């Protein structure tokens, strides 16, 4: 219907609860491996936030894997910062991590993150 | 860090994508049965939106069920409207469904929905 009312804070409240489930390791269904480093997550959140994970988990064979290994060139800290952004909308962008964050966001196909990284780099030139 | 930047539309964009996954029946992992009527969903979204589903899917035995049967007194249309609200933040509240929506939101333990239903009923008295 075109007569719906909308709760403004709903989407943010859902995301907060999904991040609390992740913190408590509740119903996490995949491990992302980045070099030495393992990250537990929900496949649905990863697909909702990344063109790479959307392609992976919509594949008839890969949708069934419980472990995904990322390219060895990917920085685990850069992935960690992007995983936190997926579950919170907050990106911990710093001079010392921006190159790794941007390279990881390009690989993961996170368009909005790549665009802000580019803007912050252009301002520093 | 306290130095994070935040993408304002992120939570809403995630929720929109989770609703597109639901529409396409991608990675749905539970069927909710309401009398004759079956609804496919993601356990994580249901837990994020409902105190009842949060209690169900954090239980060591029920977390494993792929089918959940609701109390036969629950109206399938009321459930459908609340399931759409969970995935969109929009509640299709109408004179002809408000009693069923409120009774369903009380059962599902959705506090914000119950509060608006109460306000709209009080205005009609």
């Amino acid at each position: 219907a075109d007569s719906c009312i909308q709760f403004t804070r709903h989407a943010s409240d859902v995301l907060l609860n999904l991040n609390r489930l992740r913190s408590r390791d509740i119903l996490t269904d995949v491990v992302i491996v980045v070099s030495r480093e393992q990250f537990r997550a929900h496949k649905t959140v990863l697909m909702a936030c990344s063109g790479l994970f959307y392609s992976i988990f919509t594949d008839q064979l890969k949708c069934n894997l419980s472990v995904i290994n990322l390219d060895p060139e990917i920085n685990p800290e850069g992935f960690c910062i992007l995983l936190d952004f997926m579950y919170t909308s907050r990106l911990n962008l710093r001079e010392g991590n921006i190159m790794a964050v941007m390279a990881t966001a390009m690989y993961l196909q996170m368009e909005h993150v790549v665009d802000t990284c580019r803007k912050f780099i252009k301002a520093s030139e | 860090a306290d130095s994070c930047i935040q993408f304002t539309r992120h939570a809403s964009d995630v929720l929109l994508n989770l609703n597109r996954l639901r529409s396409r029946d991608i990675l749905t992992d539970v069927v909710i049965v309401v009398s004759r009527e079956q609804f496919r969903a993601h356990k994580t979204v249901l837990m994020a939106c409902s105190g009842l589903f949060y209690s169900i899917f954090t239980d060591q035995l029920k977390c494993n069920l792929s089918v959940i049967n609701l109390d036969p007194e629950i109206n399938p249309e009321g459930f459908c409207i609340l399931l759409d609200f969970m995935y969109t933040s929009r509640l299709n509240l109408r004179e002809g469904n408000i009693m069923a929506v409120m009774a369903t939101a009380m059962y599902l333990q959705m506090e914000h929905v119950v509060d608006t239903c109460r306000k709209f009923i009080k205005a009609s008295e």
């Binding site: 009312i5 909308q6 709760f7 403004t8 | 509640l91 608006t116």
Partner: peptide, 5 residues
């Protein structure tokens, strides 16, 4: 909260 979207 609730608004007219």
């Amino acid at each position: 909260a609730w608004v007219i979207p």
